[PDB]
């Protein structure tokens, strides 16, 4: 599913991501924009052989099981395929664990490089929320 910008903002808020660990909704929408362009089915293979999955490009080295990332963990206790669903519940619950892991949203290199320090509220501007 490719979400609309405000549609995704609403779904994220519905699932309790708004201001989670102090990160405003615009931060999460911005991260999703640059990680997946709002496409739940996004996947990307990393140099280390792990894969990133879903709207927030969650990585199989630590967070989910895909059966093909040697030496990895599955800390969210989910198949990576669950992160590709039109229903963002699994991605949101896993993101909550990731952002609580110590480095906040810096876990998403794209957030650090493209969202951090910017006017992230622009991402939810105009949205009925």
Residues that bind Cl ion (CB under 5 A): 24, 26, 69, 72, 110, 113, 120-121
Which one, 24 or 85, has the nearer CB to Cl ion? 24
Taking the C-alpha atoms of residue 127 and residue 58, their distance in angstroms, rounded to an integer, is: 26
In angstroms, the Cα distances linking 95 to 43, 49, 109 are 16, 21, 14
Taking the C-alpha atoms of residue 105 and residue 85, their distance in angstroms, rounded to an integer, is: 22
How many Cβ atoms sit within 10 Å of the Cβ of residue 25? 22
CB 100 to Cl ion: min, Å: 19
Task: Output the known binding site for substrate.
Answer: 101
Catalytic residue among 7, 18, 35, 48: 35
Q: Is 7 considered catalytic here?
A: no
CB 109 to Cl ion: min, Å: 5
Query: Going along the chain, which residue ranges are E strands?
Result: 43-45, 51-53, 58-59
Which one, 14 or 87, has the nearer CB to Cl ion? 14
Task: Output the known binding site.
Answer: 101
Catalytic residue among 7, 18, 52, 119: 52
Phi and psi at 43, nearest 5°, equal: -135, 150
CB 26 to Cl ion: min, Å: 3
Catalytic residues: 35, 52
């Amino acid at each position: 599913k490719v979400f609309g910008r405000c549609e995704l903002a609403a779904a994220m808020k519905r699932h309790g991501l708004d201001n989670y660990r102090g990160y405003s909704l615009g931060n999460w929408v911005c991260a999703a924009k640059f990680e997946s362009n709002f496409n739940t089915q996004a996947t990307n293979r990393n140099t280390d052989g792990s894969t990133d999955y879903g709207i927030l490009q969650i990585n199989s080295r630590w967070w989910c099981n895909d059966g093909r990332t040697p030496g990895s963990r599955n800390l969210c206790n989910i198949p990576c395929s669950a992160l590709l669903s039109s229903d963002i519940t699994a991605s949101v619950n896993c993101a909550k664990k990731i952002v609580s892991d110590g480095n906040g949203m810096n876990a998403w290199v794209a957030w650090r490089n493209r969202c951090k320090g910017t006017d992230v509220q622009a991402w939810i501007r105009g949205c009925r929320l």
